[PDB]
Design a protein around this ligand. Sequence first.
Ligand SMILES: *[C@@H]1O[C@H](CO)[C@@H](O[C@@H]2O[C@H](CO)[C@@H](O)[C@H](O)[C@H]2NC(C)=O)[C@H](O)[C@H]1NC(C)=O
Lengths: 49, 49, 49
Amino acid sequence: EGFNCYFPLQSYGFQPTNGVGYQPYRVVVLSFELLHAPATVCGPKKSTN
Amino acid sequence: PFGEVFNATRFASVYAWNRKRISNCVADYSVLYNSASFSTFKCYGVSPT
Amino acid sequence: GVYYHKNNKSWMESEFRVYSSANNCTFEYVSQPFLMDLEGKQGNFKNLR
Ligand SMILES: *[C@@H]1O[C@H](CO)[C@@H](O[C@@H]2O[C@H](CO)[C@@H](O)[C@H](O)[C@H]2NC(C)=O)[C@H](O)[C@H]1NC(C)=O
């Protein structure tokens, strides 16, 4: 970590007092493949005769 | 002509800094750190490399 | 301004007060070298530019 050596890891300064923009947000991404195979996952419905 | 600015006998004070003009010529970055070993080199909004 | 001096037959600048000074210069340049005739003799225009 001398000259021409820089640290990959970084640390936040999260505390209540920091600006609104500087506040930490928690993000949950949801991804899914576009129905390529007859999968199972989907919502509530009714089996019609 | 960065070398003349970079290697100078005396520099101005912080209250009366020297403003200069670089126009219609070509700069470089590889001639900054090869044994320069300055205190701090960094850039904002773009990687110095 | 050019003058015909009797002591030396040549045409020197007399008053180059075209301007006062320059606050700042965005750009400066010198064009490729070439030469001039510098003759005051009367006559029809031997060249067109
Ligand atoms: C201005 O300073 C730099 C160093 O910051 C000098 O550049 C050196 O050039 C030679 C070329 O082989 C090498 O030693 C390095 O590339 C540079 N310096 C060092 C210390 O390694 C430059 O010549 C200086 N100008 C002067 C003294 O007029």
